[PDB]
Amino acid sequence: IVLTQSPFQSVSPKEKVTITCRASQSISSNLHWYQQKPDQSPKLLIKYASQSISGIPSRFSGSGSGTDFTLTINSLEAEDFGIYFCQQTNFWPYIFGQGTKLEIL
Amino acid sequence: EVQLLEQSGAEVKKPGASVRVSCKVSGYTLPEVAMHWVRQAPGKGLEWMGGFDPEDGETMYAQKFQGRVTMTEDTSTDTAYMELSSLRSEDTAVYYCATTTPFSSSYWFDPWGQGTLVTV
Amino acid sequence: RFASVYAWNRKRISNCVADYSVLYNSASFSTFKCYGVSPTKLNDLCFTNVYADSFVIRGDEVRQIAPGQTGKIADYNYKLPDDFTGCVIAWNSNNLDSKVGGNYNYLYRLFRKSNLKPFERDISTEIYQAGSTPCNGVEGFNCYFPLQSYGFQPTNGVGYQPYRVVVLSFELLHAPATVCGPKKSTNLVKNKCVNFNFNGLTGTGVLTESNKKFLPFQQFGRDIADTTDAVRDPQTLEILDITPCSF
Amino acid sequence: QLVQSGAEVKKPGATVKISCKVSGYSFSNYYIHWVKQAPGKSLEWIGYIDPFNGGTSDNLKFKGAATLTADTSTDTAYMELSSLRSEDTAVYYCARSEYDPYYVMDYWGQGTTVTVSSAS
Amino acid sequence: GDIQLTQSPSSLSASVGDRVTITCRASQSISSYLNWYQQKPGKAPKLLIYAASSLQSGVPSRFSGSGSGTDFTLTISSLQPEDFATYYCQQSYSTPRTFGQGTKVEIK
Amino acid sequence: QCVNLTTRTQLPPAYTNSFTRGVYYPDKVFRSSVLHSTQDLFLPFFSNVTWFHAIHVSGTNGTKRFDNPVLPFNDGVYFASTEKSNIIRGWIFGTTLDSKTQSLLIVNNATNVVIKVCEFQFCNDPFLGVYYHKNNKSWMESEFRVYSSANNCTFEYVSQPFLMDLEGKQGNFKNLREFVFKNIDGYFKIYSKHTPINLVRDLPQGFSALEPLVDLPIGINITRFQTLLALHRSYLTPSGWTAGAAAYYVGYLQPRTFLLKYNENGTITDAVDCALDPL
Amino acid sequence: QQLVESGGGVVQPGRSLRLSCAASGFTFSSYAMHWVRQAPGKGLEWVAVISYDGSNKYYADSVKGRFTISRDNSKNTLYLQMNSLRAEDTAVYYCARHATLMNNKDIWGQGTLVTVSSAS
Ligand SMILES: *[C@@H]1O[C@H](CO)[C@@H](O[C@@H]2O[C@H](CO)[C@@H](O)[C@H](O)[C@H]2NC(C)=O)[C@H](O)[C@H]1NC(C)=O
């Protein structure tokens, strides 16, 4: 249940920037995505990696199949990027990925 | 020594059917005596059939009646079923159950169950 | 295969090896909850008769399954008492239980004549009278079959996939406690005069090895002053000698 | 919403008790995740407690006797972390969770660091 | 007395892909205790609709049961050539159980 | 099942003198060249050991005579089997040899020994019905010739064969297999030795330093027992059982002091009684 | 999963015949079973019920000749004795099961022909 989505980001903003959670051979349909800010309590953005929770802009969509999931921050600006953690599921050790730091030009 | 039971009993069937013959045993059990069978038509001689082979440990069948006649064995309740099929005209006869020694090398049928007539 | 939850299996386990550790080495049980006290502290604690309550339920039917909770599965199939020193171990078994078309081999009691008693079940196929007019084991009006077929399909949802659930109700009774792990058995050190604790046997001295032929029934030896002289291992049976170190 | 205690600095070897209060929903019917956040590193799930019963499915990564109790009178889940050490100088989070395996860490506390040094 | 059923029509010659309406009317008010059976002459009665408003596995939505009380209907759609058989309506309200007289869909 | 073949013959049991027999290893310590002294239940020296000729082939017309009455298990039993081919088998210990009292049942097959502390129902003549399996030409042993039911069981176990017969000698053999059955406070303790017995059937004057096999928790007070015999189903002889000839020895134990001379290898060589004679 | 019925045939009126329905795949013990009649050109007319879960036998008052129904649950079988027969009862008999909104076990045998006539 290891997640190694993406070390960090360095691209021009306002592009459909993708972070691909390449899970292990544990092909788990459930997943999650949270947004962590520098010294800020993170908050789950994408619930179940397909469903959207109330109060989240559609700039960052989430999808994926089996183990390999993806999060596409479409038109990500210079005011939203941060760390983006992937969150595991039913597999008992709920280990979270190494996160997806987002730096932009 | 040994009391052999009835094999089938009073069995009568019209043409176009099939009948079993379940030879029962008492005083012994099934997997300690080899089974054998004998056709005996009224006013005719003997016609050996079925059988358990002392050699090969296999349950014989008459070479003249291969495929047509089969047998199963239930050792606990000691029921040795003999299944007939493909009824013909001259099939009606007494079907004797007999037995030979378990070990090997025996030709005699010392205990038997007075046989069973069938109907064609 | 597992059993139904209206008729679950009561596997009484006595005389058992250290296996809670293995239960942690699995690390695959979805609902691995453990009650009374935290699971790890039951590692070397030994109960007499661990009652495995073996069944298959749904991912939403395990919502009802909890110590002291109610629900169709917790009221007509398998009720869990509030006081629970056991360990509920559920894991998604959609691959195993469910087969193509729907695994209806398991059944469940959607409704019952009454409620279920702590750690019991109901296999009584007697058709309950949902209403007033009787049917007496037959079907008809104001009477329904007590058993119902699961929906166990390979396309069942995560909240409906067939979870294989074993409820290891750990039971500390007055009988000798059988099912325990290593019992805090530390590794032995050799050639060091120490206080060997060999199944309660306390004693000090240089612990070397022994060539003394202890016939299988000979675990520890003794001396002329009721002092053990040659001892043996409880975990990985091996013989040893003693010479009390220098005074 | 979850609230925690202020940031604390403690001693090695000893223990500490952090608390987390809840408001906005039924406490006794909603799990309480406890998750560590290492100093400048990734996250670590330290466990969760059921608000009603002792549903303390505890992580095995660190056995620092980080027990989880709770109180439905004051609606506060207590994480008692024992054997404080350099590996505990991280920030801990109570988090709202589903009462079913739908476990999601979406509503958190403020996050309380338990700093560990050779002194206060 | 016994609960009487009447199947209308008792026989109906149909064609490819029609929308036939086989009503089973009951002497009493039966909530949903009616079922539907398919049977070629000489075969076993294959259940089509149970509770008179619910499909059966293996049978697609071309069959559709509806109704309540005294009036029930097998509303078959997109009649394919293997649908032409003897169909039956069955009550399960009280004992004894009575079946319909049978309705035969046949090709023209 | 369990043919009632007790013939008619009680076969008055003869008497032999257990000169230096029945000295097991009682202690849990390995002592070397130590002249220890033990206050345990031993077979008395030069004690009347009842020789039970079990299957008694008579010289008139064969017609072997069956034996093995329900011998008392009063305190402990020293059993000495001499039979060449393993006609002797496990035993049927128990208080009533019936239900409500779990009758300990040892049974030795060539594969493994089977120990069952259950509530058995032994019929008149518990024996081993070693009949011809007749499939693959085998010797299947019907065990329901011992009891009639097996239920209410608390102990069950399978181990290495007790009665190991390594004949291989054809004389100077028929290994004296000795077993001390000892019902210590709900614990059946079994001892053993395979000895290359030289004499034909009498107990030789050797030191049977019996080594113990197992200590099984029973909890029931065994007061009787009866050995089991492997009987082969005979043929039409121009139902049928009683193959071979069987003879063994039964002595009883007493709580009397013994001296135990251990050796440099920690084996017992000298053993002198204390309540035997002035010397 | 399968139902076998005894051999039917012609019988003189006023006699009695035992008719067996043996099941395979799943047991008849857990469920009930029914006997249904079908004459050439006639609709399916239920005849009788047997329910092993308790103990009771329900017959059709339309055809009430005390065709007594009983069980042999050791081998998944049920016997209906046809008593006080009449010419109209000549039909094929079916061993059936009703799926009443709870189970899906509607299994039917091959069906055998009983004939009530003095002419063979
Ligand atoms: C356990 O069993 C033994 C053996 O049967 C009992 O000892 C016997 O007691 C009777 C009655 O007093 C005597 O007649 C026998 O001679 C005794 N046999 C010997 C020599 O041990 C013993 O009393 C039983 N103990 C219990 C508690 O039932």
CSV table of C-alpha atoms in Angstrom, one decimal, chain C:
chain,number,residue,atom,x,y,z
C,1,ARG,CA,-15.5,-21.0,2.8
C,2,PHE,CA,-17.2,-19.4,5.8
C,3,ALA,CA,-20.6,-19.7,7.3
C,4,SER,CA,-23.8,-17.6,7.3
C,5,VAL,CA,-24.3,-15.0,10.0
C,6,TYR,CA,-27.8,-16.2,10.9
C,7,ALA,CA,-26.0,-19.5,11.5
C,8,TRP,CA,-22.3,-18.6,12.3
C,9,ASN,CA,-19.6,-21.0,13.3
C,10,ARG,CA,-18.6,-21.2,16.9
C,11,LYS,CA,-15.0,-22.4,16.7
C,12,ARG,CA,-13.8,-22.9,20.3
C,13,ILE,CA,-10.0,-22.6,20.1
C,14,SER,CA,-8.0,-24.1,23.0
C,15,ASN,CA,-4.3,-25.2,23.0
C,16,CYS,CA,-3.0,-22.6,20.7
C,17,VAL,CA,0.4,-21.1,19.7
C,18,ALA,CA,1.4,-17.4,19.5
C,19,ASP,CA,-0.7,-16.2,16.6
C,20,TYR,CA,-1.8,-12.6,17.4
C,21,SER,CA,1.6,-11.6,16.0
C,22,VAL,CA,0.6,-13.4,12.7
C,23,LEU,CA,-2.7,-11.6,12.8
C,24,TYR,CA,-0.6,-8.4,12.7
C,25,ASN,CA,1.7,-9.8,10.0
C,26,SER,CA,-1.3,-10.2,7.8
C,27,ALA,CA,-2.1,-6.5,7.7
C,28,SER,CA,-5.0,-7.0,5.3
C,29,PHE,CA,-8.1,-7.1,7.4
C,30,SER,CA,-10.2,-4.1,6.6
C,31,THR,CA,-12.2,-3.9,9.8
C,32,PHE,CA,-9.5,-5.1,12.3
C,33,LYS,CA,-11.0,-3.7,15.5
C,34,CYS,CA,-10.1,-5.2,18.9
C,35,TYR,CA,-12.0,-4.6,22.1
C,36,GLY,CA,-11.7,-4.8,25.9
C,37,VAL,CA,-8.1,-3.5,25.6
C,38,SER,CA,-5.9,-2.6,22.6
C,39,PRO,CA,-5.1,-5.7,20.5
C,40,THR,CA,-1.3,-5.7,21.1
C,41,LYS,CA,-1.8,-6.0,24.9
C,42,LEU,CA,-3.7,-9.3,24.3
C,43,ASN,CA,-0.6,-10.7,22.6
C,44,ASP,CA,0.9,-12.7,25.5
C,45,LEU,CA,-2.4,-12.6,27.6
C,46,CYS,CA,-3.9,-16.1,27.4
C,47,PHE,CA,-7.7,-16.9,27.4
C,48,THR,CA,-9.0,-20.4,27.9
C,49,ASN,CA,-11.5,-20.8,25.0
C,50,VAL,CA,-11.3,-18.2,22.2
C,51,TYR,CA,-14.6,-18.3,20.4
C,52,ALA,CA,-14.1,-17.6,16.7
C,53,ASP,CA,-17.5,-16.4,15.5
C,54,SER,CA,-17.1,-17.2,11.8
C,55,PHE,CA,-19.5,-15.8,9.1
C,56,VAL,CA,-19.8,-13.5,6.1
C,57,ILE,CA,-21.7,-10.3,6.1
C,58,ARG,CA,-21.9,-7.1,4.0
C,59,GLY,CA,-19.8,-3.9,4.4
C,60,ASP,CA,-23.0,-2.2,5.6
C,61,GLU,CA,-24.0,-5.2,7.7
C,62,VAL,CA,-20.7,-4.9,9.6
C,63,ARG,CA,-21.9,-1.4,10.6
C,64,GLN,CA,-24.5,-3.1,12.9
C,65,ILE,CA,-21.9,-5.7,14.1
C,66,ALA,CA,-20.2,-4.1,17.1
C,67,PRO,CA,-20.2,-4.8,20.9
C,68,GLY,CA,-23.6,-3.7,22.1
C,69,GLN,CA,-25.1,-2.5,18.8
C,70,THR,CA,-28.3,-3.5,17.1
C,71,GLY,CA,-29.3,-4.1,13.5
C,72,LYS,CA,-30.7,-7.0,11.4
C,73,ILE,CA,-27.4,-8.8,11.6
C,74,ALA,CA,-26.8,-7.7,15.2
C,75,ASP,CA,-30.4,-8.7,16.3
C,76,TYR,CA,-31.5,-11.7,14.3
C,77,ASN,CA,-28.2,-13.1,13.1
C,78,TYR,CA,-25.3,-12.4,15.5
C,79,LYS,CA,-25.7,-10.1,18.5
C,80,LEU,CA,-22.6,-8.7,20.2
C,81,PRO,CA,-22.8,-8.0,23.9
C,82,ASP,CA,-21.5,-4.6,25.1
C,83,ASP,CA,-18.9,-6.2,27.5
C,84,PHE,CA,-16.5,-7.6,24.9
C,85,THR,CA,-12.9,-8.5,25.5
C,86,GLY,CA,-12.7,-10.2,22.0
C,87,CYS,CA,-11.5,-8.9,18.7
C,88,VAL,CA,-13.6,-8.3,15.5
C,89,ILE,CA,-11.7,-9.2,12.4
C,90,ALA,CA,-13.5,-8.5,9.1
C,91,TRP,CA,-11.9,-8.4,5.7
C,92,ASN,CA,-13.4,-7.8,2.2
C,93,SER,CA,-13.8,-11.2,0.5
C,94,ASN,CA,-15.6,-10.3,-2.7
C,95,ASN,CA,-13.1,-12.4,-4.7
C,96,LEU,CA,-13.7,-15.5,-2.5
C,97,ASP,CA,-17.3,-15.4,-1.3
C,98,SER,CA,-19.0,-13.8,-4.3
C,99,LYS,CA,-19.0,-15.8,-7.6
C,100,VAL,CA,-20.4,-15.0,-11.0
C,101,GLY,CA,-24.2,-14.8,-10.7
C,102,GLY,CA,-24.5,-14.2,-7.0
C,103,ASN,CA,-23.1,-16.3,-4.0
C,104,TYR,CA,-26.4,-17.4,-2.4
C,105,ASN,CA,-24.7,-20.2,-0.4
C,106,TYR,CA,-24.9,-18.0,2.7
C,107,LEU,CA,-28.2,-16.8,4.1
C,108,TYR,CA,-29.2,-14.3,6.7
C,109,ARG,CA,-32.1,-13.7,9.1
C,110,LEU,CA,-33.7,-10.5,8.0
C,111,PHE,CA,-36.5,-10.9,10.6
C,112,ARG,CA,-36.9,-13.2,13.6
C,113,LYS,CA,-39.5,-14.2,16.1
C,114,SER,CA,-37.6,-12.2,18.7
C,115,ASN,CA,-34.2,-10.7,19.5
C,116,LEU,CA,-30.9,-12.6,19.8
C,117,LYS,CA,-29.1,-13.4,23.0
C,118,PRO,CA,-25.4,-12.5,23.6
C,119,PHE,CA,-23.1,-14.7,21.5
C,120,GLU,CA,-25.9,-16.9,20.0
C,121,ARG,CA,-27.6,-17.6,16.7
C,122,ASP,CA,-30.8,-18.9,15.2
C,123,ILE,CA,-30.9,-21.8,12.7
C,124,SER,CA,-34.6,-22.4,13.2
C,125,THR,CA,-36.1,-22.5,9.7
C,126,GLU,CA,-39.6,-22.4,11.3
C,127,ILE,CA,-41.5,-19.7,9.3
C,128,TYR,CA,-42.1,-16.8,11.6
C,129,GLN,CA,-45.6,-15.2,11.7
C,130,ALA,CA,-45.0,-11.6,10.7
C,131,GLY,CA,-48.6,-10.9,11.4
C,132,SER,CA,-51.4,-12.6,13.5
C,133,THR,CA,-52.9,-15.4,11.4
C,134,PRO,CA,-50.7,-18.5,11.6
C,135,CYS,CA,-49.2,-20.7,8.9
C,136,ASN,CA,-47.4,-23.4,11.0
C,137,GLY,CA,-44.3,-23.8,9.0
C,138,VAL,CA,-46.0,-23.2,5.7
C,139,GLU,CA,-45.9,-20.0,3.6
C,140,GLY,CA,-48.8,-17.5,3.1
C,141,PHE,CA,-50.3,-14.4,4.5
C,142,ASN,CA,-48.9,-12.9,7.7
C,143,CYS,CA,-45.9,-15.3,7.6
C,144,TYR,CA,-42.5,-15.0,5.9
C,145,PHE,CA,-39.5,-17.2,5.5
C,146,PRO,CA,-36.9,-16.5,8.3
C,147,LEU,CA,-34.0,-17.0,5.9
C,148,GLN,CA,-33.1,-14.7,3.0
C,149,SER,CA,-30.5,-15.0,0.3
C,150,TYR,CA,-27.6,-12.5,0.2
C,151,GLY,CA,-26.7,-10.3,-2.7
C,152,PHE,CA,-23.1,-11.5,-3.0
C,153,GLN,CA,-22.1,-10.6,-6.6
C,154,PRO,CA,-18.7,-9.8,-8.0
C,155,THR,CA,-20.1,-6.3,-8.7
C,156,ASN,CA,-21.2,-5.7,-5.1
C,157,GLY,CA,-20.2,-2.3,-3.7
C,158,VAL,CA,-17.5,-1.7,-1.1
C,159,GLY,CA,-20.3,-1.3,1.4
C,160,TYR,CA,-21.9,-4.5,0.1
C,161,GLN,CA,-19.0,-6.7,-0.8
C,162,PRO,CA,-19.0,-9.9,1.2
C,163,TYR,CA,-16.8,-9.3,4.2
C,164,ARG,CA,-15.5,-12.6,5.8
C,165,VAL,CA,-15.7,-11.8,9.5
C,166,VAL,CA,-14.2,-13.8,12.3
C,167,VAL,CA,-15.0,-12.5,15.8
C,168,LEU,CA,-12.3,-13.8,18.1
C,169,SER,CA,-14.3,-13.4,21.3
C,170,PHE,CA,-11.4,-13.9,23.7
C,171,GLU,CA,-12.8,-15.6,26.8
C,172,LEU,CA,-10.9,-15.6,30.2
C,173,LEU,CA,-12.6,-18.4,32.1
C,174,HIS,CA,-11.6,-20.1,35.3
C,175,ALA,CA,-10.0,-23.0,33.3
C,176,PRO,CA,-6.3,-22.9,32.8
C,177,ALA,CA,-5.6,-20.2,30.2
C,178,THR,CA,-4.5,-22.0,27.0
C,179,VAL,CA,-4.3,-19.6,24.1
C,180,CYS,CA,-1.3,-17.3,24.8
C,181,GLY,CA,1.7,-16.1,22.9
C,182,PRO,CA,5.4,-16.0,23.8
C,183,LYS,CA,4.5,-14.8,27.4
C,184,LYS,CA,7.2,-12.1,27.3
C,185,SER,CA,9.9,-14.8,26.7
C,186,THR,CA,13.1,-12.9,26.2
C,187,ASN,CA,16.0,-14.5,24.3
C,188,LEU,CA,18.4,-16.6,26.4
C,189,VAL,CA,22.0,-15.5,26.9
C,190,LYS,CA,24.5,-18.2,27.5
C,191,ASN,CA,27.7,-18.3,29.6
C,192,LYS,CA,26.7,-15.5,32.0
C,193,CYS,CA,25.8,-16.2,35.6
C,194,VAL,CA,22.2,-14.9,35.8
C,195,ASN,CA,18.7,-15.4,37.3
C,196,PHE,CA,17.2,-17.8,34.8
C,197,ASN,CA,13.4,-17.7,34.9
C,198,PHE,CA,12.4,-21.1,33.5
C,199,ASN,CA,8.6,-21.4,33.7
C,200,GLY,CA,8.6,-19.7,37.1
C,201,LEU,CA,11.8,-21.5,38.2
C,202,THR,CA,14.0,-18.8,39.7
C,203,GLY,CA,17.7,-19.5,40.3
C,204,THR,CA,21.1,-17.8,39.9
C,205,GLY,CA,24.3,-19.2,38.4
C,206,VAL,CA,26.6,-19.6,35.4
C,207,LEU,CA,24.4,-21.1,32.7
C,208,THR,CA,26.5,-23.3,30.4
C,209,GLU,CA,25.3,-26.1,28.2
C,210,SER,CA,24.6,-29.7,29.5
C,211,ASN,CA,25.5,-33.1,28.0
C,212,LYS,CA,23.3,-34.6,30.7
C,213,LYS,CA,20.8,-36.9,29.1
C,214,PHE,CA,17.5,-35.5,30.2
C,215,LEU,CA,15.0,-38.1,28.9
C,216,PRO,CA,12.1,-36.2,27.3
C,217,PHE,CA,10.2,-36.1,30.6
C,218,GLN,CA,13.2,-34.5,32.2
C,219,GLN,CA,13.0,-30.7,31.8
C,220,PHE,CA,14.9,-29.4,34.9
C,221,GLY,CA,17.2,-31.4,37.2
C,222,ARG,CA,17.7,-31.1,40.9
C,223,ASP,CA,20.4,-31.4,43.6
C,224,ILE,CA,20.8,-32.7,47.1
C,225,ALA,CA,19.5,-29.4,48.5
C,226,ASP,CA,16.4,-29.1,46.3
C,227,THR,CA,18.3,-26.8,43.9
C,228,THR,CA,18.1,-27.3,40.2
C,229,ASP,CA,21.4,-28.3,38.6
C,230,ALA,CA,20.6,-28.9,34.9
C,231,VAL,CA,17.8,-27.1,33.1
C,232,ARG,CA,16.1,-26.8,29.7
C,233,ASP,CA,14.5,-24.3,27.3
C,234,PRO,CA,10.7,-23.8,27.2
C,235,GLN,CA,10.5,-22.2,23.8
C,236,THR,CA,13.1,-24.0,21.6
C,237,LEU,CA,13.8,-27.1,23.8
C,238,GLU,CA,17.5,-27.3,24.6
C,239,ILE,CA,19.4,-28.5,27.7
C,240,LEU,CA,21.7,-26.5,29.9
C,241,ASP,CA,24.0,-26.8,32.9
C,242,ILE,CA,24.4,-24.6,36.0
C,243,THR,CA,27.3,-23.7,38.2
C,244,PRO,CA,26.5,-20.9,40.8
C,245,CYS,CA,28.9,-18.2,40.0
C,246,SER,CA,31.6,-17.1,42.5
C,247,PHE,CA,30.9,-16.2,46.0
